[PDB]
Amino acid sequence: ANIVLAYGEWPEYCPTRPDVSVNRFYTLDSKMWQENSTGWYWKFPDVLNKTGVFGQNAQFHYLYRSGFCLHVQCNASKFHQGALLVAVIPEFVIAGRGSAPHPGFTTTFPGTTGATFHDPYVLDSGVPLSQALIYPHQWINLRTNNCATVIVPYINAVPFDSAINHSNFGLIVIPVSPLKYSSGATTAIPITITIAPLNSEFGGLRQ
Amino acid sequence: ANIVLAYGEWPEYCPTRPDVSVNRFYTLDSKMWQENSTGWYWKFPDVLNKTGVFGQNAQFHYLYRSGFCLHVQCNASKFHQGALLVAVIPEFVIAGRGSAPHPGFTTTFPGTTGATFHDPYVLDSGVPLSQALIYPHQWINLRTNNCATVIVPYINAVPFDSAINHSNFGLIVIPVSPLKYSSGATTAIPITITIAPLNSEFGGLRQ
Amino acid sequence: ANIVLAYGEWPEYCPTRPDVSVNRFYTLDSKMWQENSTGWYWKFPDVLNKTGVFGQNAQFHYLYRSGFCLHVQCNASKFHQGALLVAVIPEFVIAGRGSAPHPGFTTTFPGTTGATFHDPYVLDSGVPLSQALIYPHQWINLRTNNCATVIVPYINAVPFDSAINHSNFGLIVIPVSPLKYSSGATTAIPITITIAPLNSEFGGLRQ
Amino acid sequence: VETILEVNNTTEATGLTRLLIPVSSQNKADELCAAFMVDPGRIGPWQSTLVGQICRYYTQWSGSLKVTFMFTGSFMATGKMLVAYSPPGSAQPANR
């Protein structure tokens, strides 16, 4: 089950709409949730910017517009305890932390590897994490469920925008409940993310 | 006009059939027909193997099958005289000339630049050029016409075959009548080739 | 569930057909699957040759013909891991292993106790165990299921044959995945076999 | 009919252990567990299965093959595995 429709809206059609293998499932590298882990985030256009057909289209097309089918799964045992909040944050602007630093491309656009949260409490944006449930979210409880499905449509003030210099939304997973285990258990459990870009459109075929 | 249907057959459908920009017109570099010129040949799968979308498909798909719309144009003035035979040669096996040499990749698969004929009389294959009109051919006479259109379907004993290690057919242009001109005229006139791959199919999406 | 019909055939009727208590469920002694275990086999006519009514009928009747309902159950915990292949092998001829020895009755007809496999890889018959899935088989995975039901009809070139000097088929269970467990767990887990001889016929009532 | 491949046909392996692909907890993500070619006629893992033995009695074959993986681990132990098929002519992938 665990089906969630972000804002009750479906990715949709209005360009070139390939929809042959650009809509296939891309599975990012698993993240090892540890006991001292602080969480990770992924800026989605940046995530798929080098993954085969989608990467080729996104890098060599000026404009782009598509939804996304998201599946976050955490493979844990019944002897592991912890909680994980999976929220999608439209225009997740990662901020600096100078008491004026200007982050860096490794943080703002972290790629398919993703980047960790330095201060998960403030979401690295100055906003408290408690209120982050306003976004389309999903709880992952190791005691109840493992799969977290979010279907996010195209959220932008303009019908199309570049997939290389702008991040449509960010996907964050945060261990609100620290991972706890006994002796001899797997000290780091994996979190798997699969991406299905429904209704993809591309335009402006640059070299 | 100048329309010719090779063997009275049209490129056709039976894989992934993109047919969005893979069927666009690719125009190769113009060849400078000179007075001492001997002719050129192009192995077609090899020709488009690095031309954008077709190149990407052909290099990264195991199997391939398509026809071709061919347009050979020679831009000459009314003060220039000469003739040009434009024939498509299925399985144009370029041979060696050792009185046992084994040509080389620069000759067998010359690329989008093409390669010249060392002995146009024997077609570099031991067969006399006079009988080369058995193939689907077109005369280009600088006094009569400039455009030479040939539509060649898929000619193979198997429905699909690799586009990187096998050449479906070769396109040859040969100055049977040497180019002649007076003083002050353009000493080398161009020959332009445009390629339209009708009904393209690809399969086996290798990395 | 786990229902399997061997060759899509049911034990059937064509003699004396008792079918009162000869068709009851006989349960053989449980086998203790250990970590160094190699597997066991049972020649079925020999198995029931001394089990009450079936034993009396089989030993004192010249001819015999019947099917069998088989239920192999392995009682393991959720902390135990391993796999077990349960196949029925028509005319399972146990072979010798002389680099010409002639086995012995303890091996060829092992009785209700069964006999172990000396070389499970070659099935003690020179045939590799990998291909043993051609026979009507059933996987027992300690992580998925415990019961393995096979219904084997009468497989013979003749409608009747003696139940004392000929073995209609052999039932083999083999730990393809070695049993693994942690400290303090049951070091040897049991495997239980129940036999239901459907549609039994007997003839030639010898003393 | 499904039949076991001998994917662990490497050296220093005994009889029954040659049919088992060993997966362990002390192995990082994005790592290779096992790799084997698909063609059954040529020697290798398919030399043990039945379709790779019957096809050695012929010269040519053409069709779709089915590969099945079955996991023998504790019911309390879970995980994830990526099973990728590389089309012919492409070298073995170096990364997940």
Next chain:
Amino acid sequence: TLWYQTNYVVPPETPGEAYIIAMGAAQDNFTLKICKDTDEV
């Protein structure tokens, strides 16, 4: 190829080493041409 996607997580008091068996077959598309004698003998 078989890829370790995430990990092999294991609860305490449980072996940290499992096995996978690979089994193959054919489909309704399989055909064979021209018999020959094997070399396994």
Next chain:
Amino acid sequence: VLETTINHFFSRSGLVGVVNLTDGTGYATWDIDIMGFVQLRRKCEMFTYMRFNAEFTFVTTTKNGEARPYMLQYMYVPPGAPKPTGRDAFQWQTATNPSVFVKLTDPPAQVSVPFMSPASAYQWFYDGYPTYGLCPNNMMGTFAVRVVSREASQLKLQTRVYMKLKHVRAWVPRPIRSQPYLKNFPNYDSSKITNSARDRSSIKQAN
């Protein structure tokens, strides 16, 4: 759809025996068996029950090769009938043993032995006692050769038998053997065990 059938899988004549006459012993017998040669033994043992008619061709030759028109007698002795003991023994003249009289220079003799087992099918895996487990149900007869002459010549001969199966049905397929054969019994070598697959470098290398 024709080369994979059992009839086509088994229908091909092939050498099943070698027979040497001397005519100083004078004669030479050859008991009909399929498991004389490894190549055909490995094929019939893939099944359990087979039912076929065998066609035998005798390509007899002299030591050098040249064929004087000597007269030959191929006598078929069905099971139960005593086999000839000498060149001039009375079993040669028995009218119930079918005989074939051909010359050396004549084309090879060809005969058709039908399915004549006491049971309804052959079987080379017999599980029980009549390794042992040898079934007299499949003997198929015998073949005896001599030169007919009122005086014993000095000719030296070498006979080759080619057997072909037709109208062949099979039941209950079983694994093909992998261990080397050790002539009736599936004995193998306990120590020398040949793994069904050749060893490679590591499990992570595809080649």
Next chain:
Amino acid sequence: VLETTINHFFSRSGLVGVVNLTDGTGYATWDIDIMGFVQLRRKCEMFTYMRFNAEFTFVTTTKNGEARPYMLQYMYVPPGAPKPTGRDAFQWQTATNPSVFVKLTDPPAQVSVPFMSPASAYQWFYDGYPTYGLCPNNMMGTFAVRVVSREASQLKLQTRVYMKLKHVRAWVPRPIRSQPYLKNFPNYDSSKITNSARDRSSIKQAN
């Protein structure tokens, strides 16, 4: 209207090889090829794709000519199957290699090899890499000859193979060769080039 058809154009038996036995090597092989002789090579190379059944006749003779009734074995080895290495090697007795046993005095042996290429047609002009451009798609098998005998005779032999094509279809005609042949590759001589027409006195003389 009948002598110009492709079937009639190609249907005529003709010498395609010469084979010499010695029986001191003892045997002699001959790989099936059409381009062994120039006359028939020049005919099949006129087309691109051909599909036919070949009939092979073996007119074997002794050195002088006289024919003692020696027995012969013509073994057909299809592609993929290993070829015999010796007179007494085990590939002679392989049942899957079709064999023909005839005497020297018998009429010539005649067999029919069907169209059995992996592709849908043959082709002797392959443009690409598997001059090079050799296609394994057309091997057609092999023929091996030996004298069958328990002892190696001293006969010296010379075999002649006559091949006839029927049910032959052709596609994509191409020019007949004019340059002399140099056995698989269309190599010619760069310097020695033979003009397709004989030189005359002047262009104004009709004769």
